[PDB]
Design a protein around this ligand. Structure first.
Ligand SMILES: [K+]
Ligand SMILES: [K+]
Ligand SMILES: [K+]
Ligand SMILES: [K+]
Ligand SMILES: [Mg+2]
Ligand SMILES: [Mg+2]
Ligand SMILES: [Mg+2]
Ligand SMILES: [Mg+2]
Ligand SMILES: [Mg+2]
Ligand SMILES: [Mg+2]
Ligand SMILES: [Mg+2]
Ligand SMILES: [Mg+2]
Ligand SMILES: [Mg+2]
Ligand SMILES: [Mg+2]
Ligand SMILES: [Mg+2]
Ligand SMILES: [Mg+2]
Ligand SMILES: [Mg+2]
Lengths: 290, 193, 53, 98
RNA sequence: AUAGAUGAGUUUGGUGAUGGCUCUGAUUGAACACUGUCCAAAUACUUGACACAUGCUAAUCGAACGUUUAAUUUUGGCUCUUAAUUAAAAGUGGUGUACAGGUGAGUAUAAUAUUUUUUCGCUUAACUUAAAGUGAAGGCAAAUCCUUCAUAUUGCAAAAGGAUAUCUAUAUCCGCUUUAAGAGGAUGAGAAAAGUUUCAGAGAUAGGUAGUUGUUAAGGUCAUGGCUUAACAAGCCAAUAAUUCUCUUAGUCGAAGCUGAAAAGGCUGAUCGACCACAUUGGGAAUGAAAAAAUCCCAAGGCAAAUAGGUACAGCAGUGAGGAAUCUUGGUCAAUGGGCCCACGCCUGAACUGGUAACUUGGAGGAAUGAGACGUCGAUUUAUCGAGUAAAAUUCUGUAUACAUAUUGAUAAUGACAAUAUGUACAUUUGUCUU
């Protein structure tokens, strides 16, 4: 039963960015506006616009009520500590001066002096912001059906959900048929090779195959759902990327959920096609759903 | 695993076995084609044949297990039965010059007690001798002085289910009251009018 | 396939999982000894005295 | 009369039991004096064992159960069979060999 | 628990304040309207403690006891009449109906309540260990019923018998009485020291206490205390309501349910556990180790009954009524629990399971490709903008579910009903609100 919300799934007029590799979706992603118009809109009109844009991609197949409580105000992050710094300094120099360290001359004086002041001691890679706003939809990255789509085992989040519901996935060597299963750090999910080749392979064309009847490497086998010899789907390279909280092994179509997505200074691990301005309004919406 | 026990002189066939245990199980005497079918059919097979309600099927499976283990009812240890009738007689031994031990033994209806040998002079359990020349025990009807017969009877081994009198304790005074109303009302129709 | 194939313990204070409050209670087992002193129930010949043969 | 018995919990077609120390004449699921353990009747199977062998998980505080059996507690037939396997009491029933 | 604290519309000619109202968030044992495919779990008269047709929810032991007819077999007399066996049916006695289950009408509280530590006492049933004793009459048809006696460290104070084997009287089984312990307990006002208890709303009332407060003496008590008694003293508590009374409302409580960022938060007092009360209304006692009864006695009105003396579904299902509104007159004692029983076994509307309801929650309810059918439809800058990757079609999957097999819920044995696993097969709705 097709609901009213899925009619214009890849509308070229509305241009919604969906979690799939469809060619109509590639055009909507490439030609997306550099910045949505939020000049004269009110605070509600901005949060609703950001909520509609983001929810068109993140957890598209999950009800609004289920995600409303799946949303978490806890945005995890990490910091990089260089052993070379911690071995030479105990952090006292960071509390010099009046508690915040010594003062450096303003920028309009440094370059004036031909001699640059000695490098200030500090852990390398500091004074760079962390994109917390970009982690609004991190909880969705823990579902089994989503992790399968992020491992490049399926062409869409809905096709990966069918692999689970149809007993084609195996977590920790045990059959798992719940797409809402929340992976734990260390879980190893494995999909059937036959479903991955069809999901990511090219469509089976009879007209072109009809000409190839008789006229390492592989051969032809018309007794398989995908076109032989197996070749990658068209436009699959535009969506080819594996996040760092997964360790995929394509030889067996298996991956390990190493950890949860975290935000690092200057980087986020949640695949989202939206800017911090939109992810900041979506986060503000789900604080009180208004 | 499903070992079948050999029939006994007192329970030679299935119709006799179902007649003893009671619970109106002799109705299904035709479901079991042979003695080996009774002790071989399973719960699911007894259910298809139509052995119901579940109370009768579970009751049958229970007595089926007792027969295997040898936990017969009364008279099951007999050894000289004919057409379902067994005769019990008394055997007297001189335990001392001033005493005498009497035992209820089962012997053929013709041979005398003293004539039978120790091998065939079976001693039935559950039956004793009261005083002299009197056999006491369930279903022991007297035939003559010092003799009693034990015939196969319906429900001889049955675990009789308990029954209520006037509907039990809660509905005792009411069933008797309403019953008393029906009595008086009847007399009026007979002599009143 | 099991996550316990290779044991890599996590460093301390690296997770902040919030366990949910469990509803309900269990009966508190009664105390069998007094809170002070050594009772006569744990002596050498106690059982043989209160449960002779 | 103290008894070591089972309190049926769980859901429809999902039985789960508590081994408890309760007075005989009380409700089955009323709060007992103590909860000595749990008992799951449905046998489970090891995750990565393809041999087909099954097992039953039973948590029991043997030290606390021995004290109640020592003071005169009467375990039910089901709890008796469990206590006989661990090696506290003698079985009440056995498979006839003949 | 360290992330948890937020606003919006609306008074004025206008501005800033004050102060309500409404919306924004979450939820319900909900109801109604428009709708609705399947599955699981959970919940399901919130109102009239209103009235109830019918079947069931507490029975069990013949190894406590004789009666009663039935046949069977034996005596005397010549069908009747003795003494027995056997089977049934009512009973007598033992235990249990002091548990389980149901309801919230009444009930307005600080109390011989309660926590901690120290010190204690009582316990004639049942459970666990052990010891000793288990004789003699009478009454009922008989008895392990009732009455009574002997004996039981001194002297007062107990008991009950039944059943099964062995031999060419002995030994056992199940009980009974007493005693010493363990456990349990609803136990004694236990006591002392230091604490705790958010005690509904409104109104009135200044006295209350008469072993009452203290002393002496005595008794009682494990001990303490007018706990008890005699003789003296006139005290003790309170003064802002101690005490008493009227009206209104209500079962109490818990992270039990809902809710807030939070407050000794607020609200509720369903399902779960604890406690209290009640069993048509009112007035009562006995039995028992203990009232802890849906028991018993009595009165009244309703129904039934009249020469009787039952009944009250707030036990399960069900009916009528009331109401916006809440379901089956199923199966099984297989599992768990309980009563009776030497044992086997019997009973269990407790319980477990099938049914009804979108009431709630959880899950399924389909994925990928789809470009010139050079077709259709609606707007309209009649040539632009849309329906539209939408459809058709193509390639796959086999989800709820159906069927089959196996295992499992259960073992000494017992499966009412169903779960899980595996294999094969199937592509099935839109609805509703707003602008
Ligand atoms: K009761
Ligand atoms: K009430
Ligand atoms: K009812
Ligand atoms: K049962
Ligand atoms: Mg003015
Ligand atoms: Mg009600
Ligand atoms: Mg209540
Ligand atoms: Mg005697
Ligand atoms: Mg103190
Ligand atoms: Mg006094
Ligand atoms: Mg009330
Ligand atoms: Mg009534
Ligand atoms: Mg009506
Ligand atoms: Mg039982
Ligand atoms: Mg028994
Ligand atoms: Mg299936
Ligand atoms: Mg049974």
């Amino acid at each position: 039963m097709k609901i009213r919300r899925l009619f214009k799934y890849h509308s070229l007029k509305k241009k919604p960015i969906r979690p799939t590799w469809n060619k109509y979706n590639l055009y909507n992603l490439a030609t997306a506006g550099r910045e949505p118009r939020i000049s004269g809109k009110t605070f509600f009109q901005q949060k609703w616009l950001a909520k509609s844009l983001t929810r068109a991609y993140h957890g598209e197949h999950i009800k609004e009520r289920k995600w409303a409580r799946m949303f978490s105000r806890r945005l995890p992050a990490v910091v990089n500590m260089d052993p070379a710094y911690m071995a030479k300094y105990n952090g006292s120099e960071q509390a010099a001066g009046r508690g915040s360290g010594l003062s450096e001359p303003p920028a309009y004086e440094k370059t004036a002096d031909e001699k640059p002041a000695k490098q200030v001691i500090a852990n390398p890679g500091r004074k760079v912001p962390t994109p917390y706003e970009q982690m609004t939809f991190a909880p969705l990255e823990r579902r089994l059906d989503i992790a399968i789509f992020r491992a490049l085992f399926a062409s869409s989040a809905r096709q990966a959900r069918q692999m689970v519901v149809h007993g084609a996935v195996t977590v920790n060597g045990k059959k798992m048929k719940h797409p809402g299963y929340l992976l734990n750090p260390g879980d190893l999910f494995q999909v059937d090779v036959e479903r991955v080749l069809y999901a990511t392979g090219a469509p089976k064309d009879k007209k072109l195959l009809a000409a190839a009847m008789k006229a390492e490497d592989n051969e032809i086998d018309p007794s398989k759902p995908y076109m032989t010899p197996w070749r990658p789907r068209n436009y699959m390279s535009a969506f080819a990327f594996i996040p760092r909280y997964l360790e995929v092994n394509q030889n067996i179509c298996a991956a390990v959920y190493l950890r949860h997505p975290v935000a690092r200074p200057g980087e986020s691990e949640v695949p989202s096609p939206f800017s911090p301005t939109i992810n900041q309004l979506a986060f503000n919406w789900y604080l009180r759903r208004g | 695993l499903p070992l079948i026990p050999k029939p006994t002189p007192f329970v030679p066939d299935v119709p006799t076995f179902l007649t003893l245990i009671g619970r109106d199980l002799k109705q299904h005497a035709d479901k079991f084609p042979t003695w080996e079918a009774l002790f071989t059919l399973t719960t699911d097979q007894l259910r298809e044949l139509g052995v119901e309600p579940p109370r009768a099927r579970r009751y049958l499976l229970r007595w089926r297990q007792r027969f295997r283990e040898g936990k017969f009812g009364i008279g099951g240890d007999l050894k000289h039965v004919e057409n379902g009738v067994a005769y019990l007689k008394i055997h007297e031994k001189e335990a001392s010059p001033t005493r005498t031990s009497r035992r209820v033994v089962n012997v053929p209806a013709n041979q005398h007690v003293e004539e039978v040998s120790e091998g065939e002079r079976v001693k039935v359990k559950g039956y004793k001798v009261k005083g002299v020349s009197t056999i006491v025990g369930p279903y022991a009807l007297p035939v003559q002085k010092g003799v009693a017969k034990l015939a196969v009877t319906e429900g001889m081994w049955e675990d009789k289910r308990g029954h209520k009198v006037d509907g039990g304790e809660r509905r005792r005074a009411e069933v008797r009251f309403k019953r008393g109303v029906a009595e008086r009302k009847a007399l009026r129709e007979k002599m009143g009018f | 396939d099991s996550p316990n194939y290779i044991k890599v313990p996590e460093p301390p204070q690296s997770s902040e999982v919030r366990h949910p409050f469990v509803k309900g209670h269990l009966p508190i087992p009664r105390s069998i000894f007094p809170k002070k002193g050594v009772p006569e129930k744990v002596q050498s010949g106690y059982v043989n005295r209160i449960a002779p043969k | 009369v103290l008894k070591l018995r089972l309190a049926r919990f769980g859901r429809t077609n999902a039985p789960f039991y508590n081994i408890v120390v309760a007075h005989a004449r009380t409700a089955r699921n009323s709060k007992p004096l103590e909860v000595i353990g749990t008992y799951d009747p449905v046998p489970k199977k090891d995750t990565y064992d393809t041999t087909g062998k099954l097992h039953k998980d039973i948590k029991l505080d043997v030290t606390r159960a021995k004290y109640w059996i020592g003071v005169g507690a009467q375990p039910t037939d089901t709890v008796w069979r469990l206590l006989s396997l661990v090696g506290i009491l003698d079985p009440k029933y056995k498979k006839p060999q003949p």
